[PDB]
Amino acid sequence: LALSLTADQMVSALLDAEPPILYSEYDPTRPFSEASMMGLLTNLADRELVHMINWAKRVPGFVDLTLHDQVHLLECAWLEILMIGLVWRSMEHPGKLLFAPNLLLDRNQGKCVEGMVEIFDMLLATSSRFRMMNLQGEEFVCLKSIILLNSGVYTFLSSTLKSLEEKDHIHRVLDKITDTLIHLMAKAGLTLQQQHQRLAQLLLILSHIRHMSNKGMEHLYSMKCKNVVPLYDLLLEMLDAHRLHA
């Protein structure tokens, strides 16, 4: 039961749920001139999405939702989630984006079309902002979970009784995550004022993350495959697990 966790248990569950850090797939003994940067990043992102499913299923309360609802939330959120992870791992790399341990790019490497130089700079500024806030790992996992639960919660196109229950559940969990962030902050010695202030600062950054995702989606839709499985459909298949591998 997600609504029964204590703050410590919420944090411990998020921390234990973290996905791995993957590597970009390229021949390191090959000229950099030769790689397609978008190809690299597309390959990486696509591998990260499988692990994002496994992560999401471990976010307390997520699998209490309907399959359809779980797909919708991921369909709305996945790009924000890739981005907040990128920005987290880039904190200790001022001026650079740590896409993977073997793929650290500066803004000059974002310029090869099109494109990214816009998104690049925005991602770097957000990384800068987290650096300046001394964002902690325990706060980061709360925020990534909040994105998962929140990004899609006002675009469910139903007001069925089931859909009211789904939303109410999501709002309860999100409330629990707010309580957890506040707890982390009191435990770190912050005054109540600084607690409310820092909570607000962190949530306000999620709106820049939304922006960045929308801008990035604009680029990705402007380059979309034709006779392909819709994302909803890829998401649904990865989420719609059997229990034969128990």
Added chain:
Amino acid sequence: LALSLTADQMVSALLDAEPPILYSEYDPTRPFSEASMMGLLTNLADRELVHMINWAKRVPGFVDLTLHDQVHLLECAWLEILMIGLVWRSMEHPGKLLFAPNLLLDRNQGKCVEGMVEIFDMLLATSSRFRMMNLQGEEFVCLKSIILLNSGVYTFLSSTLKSLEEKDHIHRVLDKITDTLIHLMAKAGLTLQQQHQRLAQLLLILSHIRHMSNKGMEHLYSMKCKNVVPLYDLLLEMLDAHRLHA
């Protein structure tokens, strides 16, 4: 001095700053068939922007910024600000959007191209959400001010000393607005837990507002004039006031 206001003085200043509610301009004795819905809404939005300048100049701390910074924040925020106002005035109109007192549209009226039916539904859901939260007028003016100050704050493309001071000032004001929201909430009788929870719920809605603005921008850019003054430029002229009308 904005940083010296009490919570009561912040609220009183925001409340006193509210823009007027304008009317759509059309011949009411003329078939509805004949109006261009986008034409109506474009005309209205453009009139509202002048008043948004006057509003913004009254948001404590805003005119302490540089002219360039004030233009940037408005350039990033203006569509979110029109939208949050729309959603506020639509609360008491379930299923309808109160663009103006003489222009209340349901989702079926959003369908005449293209387009809006997407944006329409999103705006209605946000209105629904505020209704369900019993959003208060005093909270609404805090949130609209937060959008003004926050939407553009991580896309200033400078790290000059002046630009560090600008950002620090913005963050201080935003902090003051957080304190004010918390104050409103304690004064309304909410427990501390409910205070943190409600603060987080309200700020999380700002990310849906960002989304909606981005989607709406996508539509507006897909219909842009050629030999026209850039928005930055229109904004700069309206903001770059003389003091000859004292």
